[PDB]
Design a protein around this nucleic acid. Structure first.
Ligand SMILES: [Mg+2]
Ligand SMILES: [Mg+2]
Ligand SMILES: [Mg+2]
Ligand SMILES: [Mg+2]
Ligand SMILES: [Mg+2]
Length: 170
RNA sequence: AGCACAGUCUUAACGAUGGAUGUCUUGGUUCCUACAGCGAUGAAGGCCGCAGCAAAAUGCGAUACGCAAUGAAAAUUGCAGUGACUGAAUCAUCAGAAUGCUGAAUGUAAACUACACCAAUUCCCUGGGAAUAGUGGUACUCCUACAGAAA
């Protein structure tokens, strides 16, 4: 994992190797999640899956609509990336399980590192124009998630000068 | 429990993506040396097969990843199985045996496993007794010899 941890005893990690979900949506979801208690994050994910709360598309915001729920994050654009959300939820669950297996309280766990890297594209073919074959590739991803339990010089002359200054002030 | 606006750009650390560089290398490369034809005794090429579990390549040919014989010589192994305590397991060598169907392909054919005709053919035992629709042969040109006809 990418993060500098020091003590892995208070941390619980979870990974997703090559996910069949779009890199951008998933990234957005991750961003939305970040710096949150694990349970709260899970709840948020659930809500998004049921189309109650949206994730704000702030980075990859090209063409994404203009939802009502985006006002919650001071933004205008937002979406409900279902499959991606589900994937993320699964990973969260895994992380939770891992934590349980150790000795970490799930209530005091915060997501300290939610990384989404883009995996190698799954190549497919699309057919265009005047007999033209074009790449119809997917954008798979790796997801890395880390949860964590959260609760000169003197100089004599210089000294003299300082003293003088003090005296002056007085 | 709080707190960072967000985005865009930049820097550093740590990662992804990619396969550059470095290091290798049972390949190539050129040069040198040496030998140097295979085929109607059926070649090269091409099909079809062939393993217990078997696709390709490799190897081989209905004895089919090999038979015999020679020289080594205890293993072979994924499993199954087979052997040693030396013609046997495995290599190497290869001279003997064998070498499907084709292909110059040569009985006539060919998008045929089509079809003729002449031999019936083959094996066993020391003249009989068994077999199989199976095996041979039959092209065109030519040469030498023979044959009997023609002028
Ligand atoms: Mg900012
Ligand atoms: Mg032998
Ligand atoms: Mg021997
Ligand atoms: Mg013929
Ligand atoms: Mg015909």
């Amino acid at each position: 994992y990418a993060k500098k941890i020091r003590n892995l005893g208070k941390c619980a990690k979870g990974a997703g190797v090559d996910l069949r979900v779009h890199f951008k949506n998933t990234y957005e979801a991750a961003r939305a999640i970040r710096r949150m208690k694990l349970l709260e994050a899970k709840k948020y994910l659930n809500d998004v899956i049921e189309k109650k709360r949206c994730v704000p598309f702030r980075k990859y915001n090209g063409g994404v609509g203009r939802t009502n729920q985006a006002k919650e994050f001071n933004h205008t654009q937002g979406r409900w990336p279902a499959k991606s959300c589900k994937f993320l939820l699964n990973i969260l669950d895994n992380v939770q399980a891992n934590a349980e297996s150790r000795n970490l309280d799930v209530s005091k766990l915060r997501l300290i590192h939610v990384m989404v890297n883009k995996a190698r594209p799954g190549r497919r073919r699309t057919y265009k124009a005047h007999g033209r074959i074009n790449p119809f590739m997917s954008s798979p991803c790796h997801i890395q998630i880390i949860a964590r339990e959260i609760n000169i010089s003197n100089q004599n002359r210089l000294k003299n000068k300082s003293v003088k200054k003090q005296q002056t002030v007085q």
